[PDB]
Amino acid sequence: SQKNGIATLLQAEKEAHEIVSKARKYRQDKLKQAKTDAAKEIDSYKIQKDKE
Amino acid sequence: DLSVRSLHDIVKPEDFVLNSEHLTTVLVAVPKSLKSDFEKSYETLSKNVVPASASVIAEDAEYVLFNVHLFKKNVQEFTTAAREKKFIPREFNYSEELIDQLKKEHDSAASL
Amino acid sequence: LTPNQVNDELNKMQAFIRKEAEEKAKEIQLKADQEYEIEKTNIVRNETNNID
């Protein structure tokens, strides 16, 4: 057969697809928020110098 | 010869479940007399065997055919052992893009 | 052997697939945090000099 020790592995690898997709999504979100923080901290630094 | 013939009626998804890889199958063709070397090696052969992957699958009355599904990490042991138990190394899988080639070529040769 | 113990090894393998997926996702998150920090610091350093 092919339904013993495989279909359970099929569900396992579908869960693997889901988990790796989660990790990818966290990669993109971390990158995006990294750039956002980089752009906003410099903005605050700028709003300091005009007041200076 | 029944060992060199390119089979086109036993390869199927139901025995070649080509999907997200977990296993590694292989076809076997052994004479009838040596059937004890494989039958009595039902599960002492090695680890990582697949249930119903050694039971009766197909018999040609001269060779016996199965689908030896071993996992995708411990292929080394059975690959090494295949050279001392007379296993045919013809790596076949469910791939119509090659199955159709032989039939089309034979018919075209006859027609030409 | 008996079909049950090979089934126990099968269970070990369903556990293995998910364990490996979780491990790789964890490593992905770790390197995600590292790139978070480094990328955020880069533009911060650059602009702290440009605005100066």
UniProtKB/Swiss-Prot annotation, chain B:
The keyword Transcription does not apply. GO terms for biological process: endosomal lumen acidification; Golgi lumen acidification; proton transmembrane transport; vacuolar acidification. GO terms for cellular component: fungal-type vacuole membrane; Golgi membrane; proton-transporting V-type ATPase complex; vacuolar proton-transporting V-type ATPase complex; vacuolar proton-transporting V-type ATPase, V1 domain. Its main location: membrane. Keywords: Acetylation, ATP-binding, Hydrogen ion transport, Ion transport, Membrane, Nucleotide-binding, Transport, Vacuole. It is found in: Vacuole membrane. One of its GO terms (molecular function) is proton-transporting ATPase activity, rotational mechanism. V-ATPase is a heteromultimeric enzyme composed of a peripheral catalytic V1 complex (components A to H) attached to an integral membrane V0 proton pore complex (components: a, c, c', c'', d, e, f and VOA1). Interacts directly with VMA4. Subunit of the V1 complex of vacuolar(H+)-ATPase (V-ATPase), a multisubunit enzyme composed of a peripheral complex (V1) that hydrolyzes ATP and a membrane integral complex (V0) that translocates protons. V-ATPase is responsible for acidifying and maintaining the pH of intracellular compartments. Subunit C is necessary for the assembly of the catalytic sector of the enzyme and is likely to have a specific function in its catalytic activity. Reversibly leaves the enzyme after glucose depletion, causing the catalytic subcomplex V1 to detach from the V0 section. Present with 21114 molecules/cell in log phase SD medium. Belongs to the V-ATPase C subunit family. This is V-type proton ATPase subunit C. The chain holds residues 169 to 280 of 392 of the full protein.
Curated annotation (Swiss-Prot), chain C:
Keywords: Acetylation, Coiled coil, Hydrogen ion transport, Ion transport, Membrane, Transport, Vacuole. Residues 12-31 are annotated as: Interaction with VMA10. It is found in: Vacuole membrane. Residues 1-13 are annotated as: Interaction with VMA5. One of its GO terms (molecular function) is proton-transporting ATPase activity, rotational mechanism. One of its GO terms (biological process) is proton transmembrane transport. It comes from the Eukaryota. Subunit of the V1 complex of vacuolar(H+)-ATPase (V-ATPase), a multisubunit enzyme composed of a peripheral complex (V1) that hydrolyzes ATP and a membrane integral complex (V0) that translocates protons. V-ATPase is responsible for acidifying and maintaining the pH of intracellular compartments. Belongs to the V-ATPase E subunit family. Homodimer. V-ATPase is a heteromultimeric enzyme composed of a peripheral catalytic V1 complex (components A to H) attached to an integral membrane V0 proton pore complex (components: a, c, c', c'', d, e, f and VOA1). Interacts with VMA5; the interaction is direct. Interacts with VMA10; the interaction is direct. Interacts with RAV1 and RAV2 components of the RAVE complex, which are essential for the stability and assembly of V-ATPase. This is V-type proton ATPase subunit E. It comes from Saccharomyces cerevisiae (strain ATCC 204508 / S288c) (Baker's yeast). The chain holds residues 8 to 59 of 233 of the full protein.
